[PDB]
Design an enzyme around this catalytic site. Structure first.
Site, short mmCIF file in Angstrom:
data_model
loop_
_atom_site.label_atom_id
_atom_site.label_comp_id
_atom_site.label_asym_id
_atom_site.label_seq_id
_atom_site.Cartn_x
_atom_site.Cartn_y
_atom_site.Cartn_z
N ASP A 127 2.52 -29.84 8.42
CA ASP A 127 3.45 -30.11 9.51
C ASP A 127 3.06 -31.36 10.28
O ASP A 127 1.87 -31.60 10.50
CB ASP A 127 3.50 -28.91 10.46
CG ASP A 127 4.57 -29.05 11.52
OD1 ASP A 127 5.73 -29.33 11.16
OD2 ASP A 127 4.25 -28.88 12.72
N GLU B 73 4.74 -33.33 5.56
CA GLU B 73 6.04 -33.61 6.17
C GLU B 73 6.03 -34.95 6.91
O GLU B 73 5.47 -35.07 7.99
CB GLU B 73 6.46 -32.50 7.14
CG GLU B 73 7.82 -32.75 7.79
CD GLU B 73 7.92 -32.18 9.19
OE1 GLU B 73 6.86 -31.98 9.83
OE2 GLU B 73 9.05 -31.94 9.66
#
Ligand SMILES: [Ca+2]
Ligand SMILES: [Cl-]
Lengths: 44, 496
Positions: free
Chosen positions: B197, B233
């Site tokens: 993330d 990401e």
């Protein structure tokens, strides 16, 4: 379409504007605004 | 961090967004295993701050307060049970790793958290980890607000607080060690890899430094010397200071250009045409295929304001969505992830969906179990796109044709397109407002093949459309523009 929208992080997306409202926060340098600011509010 | 470590022959992951661990275990056993799925991306399994205003939004799980495996999806026993049961049927588990930050810097101190741990965000105190003030980047950040003010400055992007979330000092050995300890606990439990993330908001070398501390995967299910699969990401549609390529050394990278451009094409916006997809992939300026994690939509942009804007296709647009997902799953570019969602009550007000915050189906904050209907759909407001015949059969398609080269492309100069994958599969799309009726070279051996989009090969017969391929490899394809699914796909394991 596509529209104006500048995603920052989970639950935080802004609107591309030349200048942001009194109660908004600005993020410069985002490609999708094309020179504009990203004007958002955080939900916290 | 590059080989997916899925069981041999399995080529996709499904995001089981906000699913409970026990439901994932059951789905692995009853469905994902038998249907050839490579793995499941799970929501953050670490304890997060409880957000009550609004009432338990999905995005509260990206605001960690500890590394305890104690969330609305379940506790540590249930998580372990899930990973064991899934791995035992050849389905891997990939964790959404939220490591750039902890909860909001402006949050109140107390025990409003999913496991009841105490934290004091204002004083940078997270005793359940433990973290203290000198474990954050407050002294490193150079902005007046302490937050990210400009994406033109990579230093600000990495060292300052992302939307007020406390930014961990990933340069420090201690922080790297706490994170590594968490990830290693997960690995030893049996996790196959991680979605990193907010990777744009971390330095590539800090990420690498964390990855180098990671154990090899658990030898109960993986070969010795196996490294965790890593996909970072990073949203980069181009034109910003930070490029996707900075992260290629750590693992694969999410290619957000993929779903945005594909969505634009399938919707036929901006003059785009499906025939333009002939050079789909690196030809469109995308990252290298072996660096890409690709997808039509994700949990962010499916709500109409992530990366891609309104161009993103989702379950709400099921027909075109199925077209896009089918194209992606047939095409060799990237490693594919399919989304699995729950439906919320969308409410667009001045272009903004004001209910885009709504968390998974729940009774008073307790997540509803995933129920299966007789027709194999899900109840309790789980959409279960991964259970749609047109999508699951294309997952299988992708498994069948893995390794086969792009071949036998055809188009009508408009929005009717076709291509194959060596001699093991072929796919045909009609996205024009008129009949498709063409004889095409499929590259496939002669025989009768079941169309796996309209039906299935079940034992020795077809439940849907049949395609007769001649010995020279040519076949007639007839697809109406009014068809429920205006595309057909056939492969080696669907031949009668
Ligand atoms: Ca950071
Ligand atoms: Cl993602």
């Amino acid at each position: 379409e596509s529209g104006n929208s500048c995603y920052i992080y989970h639950g935080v997306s802004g609107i591309c504007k030349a200048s942001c409202a009194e109660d908004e926060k600005a993020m410069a340098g985002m490609g999708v605004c094309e020179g504009h600011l990203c004007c958002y509010k955080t939900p916290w | 961090q590059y080989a997916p470590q899925t069981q041999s022959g399995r080529t996709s992951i499904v995001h089981l967004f906000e699913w409970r661990w026990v439901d994932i275990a059951l789905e692995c056993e009853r469905y994902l295993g038998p249907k050839g799925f490579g793995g499941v991306q799970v929501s953050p399994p670490n304890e997060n701050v409880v957000v009550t205003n609004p009432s338990r939004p999905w995005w509260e799980r990206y605001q960690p307060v500890s590394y305890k495996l104690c969330t609305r999806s379940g506790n540590e026993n249930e998580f372990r049970d899930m990973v064991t049961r899934c791995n035992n049927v050849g389905v891997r588990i990939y964790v959404d790793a939220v490591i750039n930050h902890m909860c909001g810097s402006g949050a109140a101190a107390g025990t409003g958290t999913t496991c009841g741990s105490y934290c004091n965000p204002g004083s940078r105190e997270f005793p359940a980890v433990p973290y203290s003030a000198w474990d954050f980047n407050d002294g490193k950040c150079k902005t007046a607000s302490g937050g990210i003010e400009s994406y033109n400055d990579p230093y600000q992007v990495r060292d300052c607080q992302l939307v007020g979330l406390l930014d961990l000092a990933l340069e420090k050995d201690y922080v790297r060690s706490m994170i590594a300890d968490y990830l290693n606990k997960l690995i030893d439990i049996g996790v196959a890899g991680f979605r990193i993330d907010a990777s744009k908001h971390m330095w590539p070398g800090d990420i690498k430094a964390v990855l180098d501390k990671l154990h090899n995967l658990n030898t109960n299910w993986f070969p010795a010397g196996s490294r965790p699969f890593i996909f970072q990401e990073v949203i980069d549609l181009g034109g910003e200071a930070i490029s996707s390529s900075e992260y290629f050394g750590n693992g694969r990278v999410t290619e957000f250009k993929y779903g945005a451009k594909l969505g634009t094409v399938v919707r036929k916006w901006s003059g785009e045409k499906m025939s333009y997809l002939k050079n789909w992939g690196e030809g469109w300026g995308f990252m290298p295929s072996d660096r890409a994690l690709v997808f039509v939509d994700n949990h962010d942009n499916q709500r109409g304001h992530g990366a891609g804007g309104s161009s993103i296709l989702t379950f709400w647009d099921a027909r075109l969505y199925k077209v896009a997902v089918g194209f992606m799953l047939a095409h060799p570019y990237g490693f594919t992830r399919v989304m699995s969602s729950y439906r919320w009550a969308r409410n667009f007000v001045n272009g903004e969906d004001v209910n885009d915050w709504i968390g998974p189906p729940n009774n008073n904050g307790v997540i509803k179990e995933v129920t299966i209907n007789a027709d194999t759909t899900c109840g309790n407001d789980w959409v279960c796109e991964h259970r749609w015949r047109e999508i699951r059969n294309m997952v299988w398609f992708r498994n069948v044709v893995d390794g086969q080269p792009f071949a036998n492309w055809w188009d009508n100069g408009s929005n009717q397109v076709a291509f194959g994958r060596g001699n093991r599969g072929f796919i045909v799309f009609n996205n024009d407002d008129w009949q498709l009726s063409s004889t095409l070279q499929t590259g496939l051996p002669g025989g009768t093949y079941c169309n796996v989009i309209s039906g299935d090969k079940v034992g020795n017969s077809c439940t849907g459309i049949k395609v007769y391929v001649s010995s020279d490899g040519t076949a007639q394809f007839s697809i109406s523009n009014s068809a429920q699914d205006p595309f057909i796909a056939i492969h080696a394991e669907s031949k009668l």
